[PDB]
Amino acid sequence: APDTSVSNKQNFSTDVIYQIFTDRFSDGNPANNPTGAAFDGTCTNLRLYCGGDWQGIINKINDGYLTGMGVTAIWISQPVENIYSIINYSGVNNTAYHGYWARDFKKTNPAYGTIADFQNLIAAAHAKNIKVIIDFAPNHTSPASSDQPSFAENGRLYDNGTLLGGYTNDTQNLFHHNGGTDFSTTENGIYKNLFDLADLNHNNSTVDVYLKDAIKMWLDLGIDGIRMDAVKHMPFGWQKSFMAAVNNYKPVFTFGEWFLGVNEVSPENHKFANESGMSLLDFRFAQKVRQVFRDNTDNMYGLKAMLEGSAADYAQVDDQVTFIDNHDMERFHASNANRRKLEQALAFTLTSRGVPAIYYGTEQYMSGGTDPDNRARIPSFSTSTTAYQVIQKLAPLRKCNPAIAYGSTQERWINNDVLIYERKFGSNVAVVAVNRNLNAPASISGLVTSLPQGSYNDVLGGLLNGNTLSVGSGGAASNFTLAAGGTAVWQYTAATATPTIGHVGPMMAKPGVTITIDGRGFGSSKGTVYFGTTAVSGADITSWEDTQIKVKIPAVAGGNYNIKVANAAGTASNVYDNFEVLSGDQVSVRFVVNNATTALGQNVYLTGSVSELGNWDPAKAIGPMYNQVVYQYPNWYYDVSVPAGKTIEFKFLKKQGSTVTWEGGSNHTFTAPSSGTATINVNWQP
Ligand SMILES: OC[C@H]1O[C@H](O[C@H]2[C@H](O)[C@@H](O)[C@@H](O)O[C@@H]2CO)[C@H](O)[C@@H](O)[C@@H]1O
Ligand SMILES: OC[C@H]1O[C@H](O[C@H]2[C@H](O)[C@@H](O)[C@@H](O)O[C@@H]2CO)[C@H](O)[C@@H](O)[C@@H]1O
Ligand SMILES: OC[C@H]1O[C@H](O[C@H]2[C@H](O)[C@@H](O)[C@@H](O)O[C@@H]2CO)[C@H](O)[C@@H](O)[C@@H]1O
Ligand SMILES: [Ca+2]
Ligand SMILES: [Ca+2]
């Protein structure tokens, strides 16, 4: 199939995601509605169930709401069974309507539906070319109180009906008993509880294996992708071992939530996105769009900077999921604000790099503050709004104009209020003009583009006061006026003759797994695929089309590799870098080093004999290690993904800047478990 097909679970770059709070969308089946005090059919009390379910979703899919908008993927609430208690938080009653309070990951939330309803959801969606994504929140179970076991469900965890354990009397040590996090450090926010939610302990084999098996069930149920919750609150290595579990089984596009505030830029965040095996929700993008288009606390220069910086910081920028709002922020649209702000922000997002996500109700101009105010019931299914139409005209370009789906981004004109950028990929171009100034038009002269000579109509048809563009020789546009609040899209598409790789997924897996290479100009004849210098051709290439190639990872050593393709005539493509070949299936192992004292600004790191440990390359060592919570300085620890059942040699190092100090003696050694987790405790050798 082509890169654009509903069946492509590895690439969402050509899609438009619609984020839905199941409960708050559409109650298509009143029979599964909770009853009594857990339910409010008026949906006036935003903390209770309103009754929205899978059936309702199916209904809106079939009646043209979503399809008419141009939406091609839906992201829904965590489908697993949640706790049934009503929690009174100081007078107020709270239900698990949101789906973040898991009790059993192997069952469904009966208020959403049955497994059968789930299967129907998948079917109907797929039938309409819509991919399905689900939320998955393995960091915890539910709100618990260790000495008030009667509170809620004591964070009880069940394995398909079987009680595994509770927060009180956790002799198995299924959970963390370190208190609550103050969000003070990253380590602090991982090994302590989030609020009162029972923190799952991923270092417990039971827990480890359980979750890895649970996700497989959903995978087998046909999902298209996963949205991981609280990735910043779980161990990095564990998560990587989790991703490996998914990828080495049935890969699907996965993205996690790592909250970023205004003006916040985190290197931990970049590294995580670049190395864990998953991508992230683009908070950096969201926050910046809001400052510029919403709160006017930054200008075009700021947007520009975010665009260029993010492209340099994320190895795969096109995999970051963009948005203007979601369940954790107040609604972009403010009661009294000018609607054109929302419309422009939408237009901007839909035509920018990454994977756009639209929070349900945006198209309806919903307003609301933070939780739960931003989780109201969609007031209507009218296609008559301007926002609905904007989406409707733009979403589809992601599928038909690869410049939008995979192109580079380049500023062509700019001022405080205006931004003109160009997207480009192969013989395809898109040019977007945005004028945030709601009161002043702008005089656009000197605009140069890659568009061929001719006249271009605004793809928005003037909907946001866009105009026509006139390109002369050299791609120079003649002068024009960009209306106040003006937004225009111009484009050019043509066949690409040379092989051009636009995307690859998954980005990390063991030899033998099939990966998907998307782009253009591959031709219809099987060519060759290179992993570094290794050539792959023939049978291992399971499928070859002009826009997509499916190939099995050869059995090469674990490491990072560049991917390139050559058509049947031998013409080579551009390189796609950062592909990770695992050394095999992975397990999560905790490394502990005793008495490794350091000087200020000096941290301990881990290295070793396998690619997963950097192959003795200090520039690729794991760390810095932690030393506050689980173990205390001068003892250090860290959770790491490693090849299962392998005998590994390793050493620790003290790094300062790029200056490194090695542990003395000889390599420590160990053999990874075959499954489950393990803990290796050693002393630092001077
Ligand atoms: O002429 C090419 C030139 O175009 C753009 O520069 C704009 C600038 O952004 C506007 O603020 C205004 O000063 O007009 C200039 C064009 O005359 C690109 O920003 C620039 O890099 C490029 O060279
Ligand atoms: O919290 C981690 C912290 O650990 C390291 O610093 C050690 C320091 O080297 C010791 O002399 C001692 O005073 O304890 C510190 C840990 O609390 C790293 O030097 C530092 O960058 C890191 O944040
Ligand atoms: O470079 C590969 C090499 O790395 C490590 O050797 C360290 C050694 O442990 C240190 O004591 C110090 O001498 O630096 C060496 C780096 O050249 C591994 O121990 C070794 O097995 C591996 O071959
Ligand atoms: Ca219902
Ligand atoms: Ca945690």
Side-chain angles (χ1 to χ4, degrees):
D3 61 331
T4 54
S5 157
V6 76
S7 70
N8 192 351
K9 305 182 182 257
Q10 285 78 46
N11 174 357
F12 277 66
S13 309
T14 75
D15 297 295
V16 176
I17 301 170
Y18 189 86
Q19 182 196 178
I20 299 162
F21 249 63
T22 312
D23 192 50
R24 311 296 159 85
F25 190 71
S26 184
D27 181 1
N29 169 33
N32 51 36
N33 299 9
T35 64
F39 186 68
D40 176 10
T42 77
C43 207
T44 294
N45 183 344
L46 300 180
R47 293 169 151 113
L48 274 19
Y49 280 87
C50 302
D53 46 42
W54 300 327
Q55 193 48 64
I57 299 175
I58 280 147
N59 287 343
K60 298 318 277 167
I61 281 169
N62 294 148
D63 76 6
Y65 187 75
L66 303 168
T67 63
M69 201 181 338
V71 160
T72 63
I74 54 160
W75 153 20
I76 66 180
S77 317
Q78 181 165 240
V80 324
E81 191 190 49
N82 271 225
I83 53 137
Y84 299 99
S85 305
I86 287 168
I87 292 156
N88 173 102
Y89 280 120
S90 310
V92 261
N93 272 356
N94 290 269
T95 71
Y97 77 89
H98 42 77
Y100 304 112
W101 293 344
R103 110 195 267 273
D104 182 331
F105 296 75
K106 294 164 149 172
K107 314 229 294 248
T108 74
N109 177 326
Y112 303 160
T114 66
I115 308 257
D117 300 318
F118 196 77
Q119 288 165 150
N120 286 148
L121 180 38
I122 300 302
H126 288 172
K128 306 276 232 123
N129 296 314
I130 294 164
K131 292 181 193 171
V132 178
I133 290 149
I134 64 180
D135 253 350
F136 199 63
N139 168 77
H140 60 265
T141 51
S142 48
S145 175
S146 22
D147 42 84
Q148 221 172 301
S150 43
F151 168 72
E153 301 197 13
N154 199 230
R156 286 185 278 266
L157 177 79
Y158 303 76
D159 179 355
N160 188 32
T162 306
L163 203 232
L164 292 178
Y167 201 66
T168 295
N169 272 300
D170 175 36
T171 43
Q172 256 150 137
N173 244 91
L174 295 193
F175 305 93
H176 278 138
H177 304 274
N178 302 304
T181 180
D182 62 352
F183 301 102
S184 69
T185 58
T186 294
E187 178 192 344
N188 191 277
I190 287 169
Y191 303 97
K192 296 189 177 176
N193 294 352
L194 263 209
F195 307 121
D196 57 353
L197 302 166
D199 213 59
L200 284 170
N201 166 34
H202 307 96
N203 182 58
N204 167 312
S205 281
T206 286
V207 167
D208 174 59
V209 173
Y210 169 76
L211 296 173
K212 286 154 170 177
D213 283 329
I215 194 61
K216 292 187 214 161
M217 175 192 277
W218 300 101
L219 284 180
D220 288 341
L221 288 144
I223 67 194
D224 303 295
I226 300 155
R227 204 291 297 211
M228 296 268 277
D229 170 79
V231 309
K232 193 193 196 275
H233 306 286
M234 305 173 273
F236 315 149
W238 180 81
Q239 297 184 86
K240 181 193 187 180
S241 83
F242 175 90
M243 282 307 314
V246 170
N247 299 351
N248 294 335
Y249 179 61
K250 275 145 141 132
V252 308
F253 186 66
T254 310
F255 63 104
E257 168 137 26
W258 182 310
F259 185 97
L260 288 178
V262 200
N263 284 306
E264 176 180 0
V265 175
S266 167
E268 269 183 316
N269 173 116
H270 306 151
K271 186 169 184 69
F272 182 88
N274 289 345
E275 295 167 1
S276 72
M278 69 183 89
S279 52
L280 293 172
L281 282 160
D282 203 341
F283 272 95
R284 193 164 169 192
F285 185 98
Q287 307 282 19
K288 186 66 60 183
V289 164
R290 283 168 135 260
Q291 284 191 281
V292 180
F293 293 96
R294 201 191 184 248
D295 308 307
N296 313 93
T297 57
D298 200 3
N299 58 29
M300 298 301 197
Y301 295 98
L303 206 60
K304 175 174 132 140
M306 170 276 295
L307 292 168
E308 346 239 81
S310 63
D313 299 330
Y314 297 99
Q316 301 87 235
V317 84
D318 309 291
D319 276 330
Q320 306 320 307
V321 185
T322 61
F323 56 102
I324 81 193
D325 74 11
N326 61 24
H327 59 289
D328 290 330
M329 308 184 137
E330 24 170 281
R331 302 201 80 135
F332 184 105
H333 184 63
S335 211
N336 42 286
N338 191 329
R339 279 155 175 236
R340 177 72 45 104
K341 304 221 255 226
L342 182 155
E343 313 156 345
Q344 289 192 321
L346 272 179
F348 179 77
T349 302
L350 296 169
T351 58
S352 278
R353 87 305 178 276
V355 179
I358 293 169
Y359 188 43
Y360 82 94
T362 295
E363 72 285 6
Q364 307 293 335
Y365 308 92
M366 297 177 61
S367 321
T370 60
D371 171 30
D373 283 323
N374 45 359
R375 288 111 100 130
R377 176 191 274 157
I378 183 165
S380 98
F381 300 116
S382 167
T383 77
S384 296
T385 82
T386 299
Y388 187 99
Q389 293 186 260
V390 166
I391 297 170
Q392 166 180 278
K393 298 260 186 49
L394 302 177
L397 318 175
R398 295 199 82 92
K399 303 262 174 212
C400 65
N401 187 339
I404 283 143
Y406 309 125
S408 57
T409 302
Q410 205 199 151
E411 168 267 304
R412 344 257 345 208
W413 206 104
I414 186 191
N415 83 15
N416 283 167
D417 299 305
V418 177
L419 171 80
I420 308 187
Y421 57 97
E422 185 171 282
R423 303 294 306 291
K424 202 163 158 36
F425 182 93
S427 313
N428 308 275
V429 189
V431 182
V432 184
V434 190
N435 171 17
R436 47 106 89 143
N437 204 317
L438 254 38
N439 292 117
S443 249
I444 283 132
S445 38
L447 171 68
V448 174
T449 75
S450 297
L451 285 170
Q453 180 161 219
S455 233
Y456 298 79
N457 293 351
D458 165 33
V459 167
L460 277 165
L463 193 64
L464 313 169
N465 303 94
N467 47 279
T468 294
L469 190 82
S470 267
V471 185
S473 59
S478 65
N479 309 156
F480 70 95
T481 300
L482 183 59
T487 307
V489 182
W490 306 289
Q491 81 170 324
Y492 170 93
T493 52
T496 296
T498 65
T500 313
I501 298 173
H503 190 275
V504 178
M507 279 309 283
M508 161 194 95
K510 69 172 184 165
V513 174
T514 296
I515 60 174
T516 313
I517 307 172
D518 291 318
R520 296 286 179 293
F522 295 152
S524 58
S525 250
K526 258 190 199 194
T528 307
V529 167
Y530 298 78
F531 285 80
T533 56
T534 296
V536 171
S537 64
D540 285 354
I541 288 182
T542 73
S543 68
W544 189 294
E545 297 175 35
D546 198 55
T547 76
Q548 180 165 106
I549 301 160
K550 285 183 124 205
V551 59
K552 308 197 147 156
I553 304 179
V556 289
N560 226 75
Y561 294 80
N562 287 350
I563 290 162
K564 142 185 84 124
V565 316
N567 63 8
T571 295
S573 67
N574 52 300
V575 171
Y576 200 96
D577 57 301
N578 195 50
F579 185 83
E580 177 171 10
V581 171
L582 294 173
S583 282
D585 294 304
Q586 307 281 300
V587 282
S588 187
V589 169
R590 166 160 304 166
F591 295 69
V592 192
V593 60
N594 311 265
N595 345 299
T597 58
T598 42
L600 284 168
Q602 188 176 60
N603 284 295
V604 180
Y605 293 75
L606 164 73
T607 198
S609 78
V610 296
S611 53
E612 289 83 340
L613 263 40
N615 272 322
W616 302 115
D617 184 0
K620 290 181 255 221
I622 304 312
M625 301 179 59
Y626 288 163
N627 57 10
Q628 291 149 36
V629 189
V630 188
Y631 299 73
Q632 289 80 227
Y633 171 92
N635 295 332
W636 307 59
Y637 70 106
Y638 211 72
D639 300 328
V640 179
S641 186
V642 307
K646 313 225 158 186
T647 298
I648 305 166
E649 277 186 353
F650 60 103
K651 244 156 128 115
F652 290 95
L653 34 157
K654 286 162 185 175
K655 265 181 95 203
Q656 186 177 23
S658 62
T659 290
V660 57
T661 305
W662 289 85
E663 211 191 337
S666 35
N667 298 343
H668 299 277
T669 304
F670 97 110
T671 303
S674 284
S675 77
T677 67
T679 302
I680 318 176
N681 207 322
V682 307
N683 304 301
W684 169 280
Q685 306 159 172

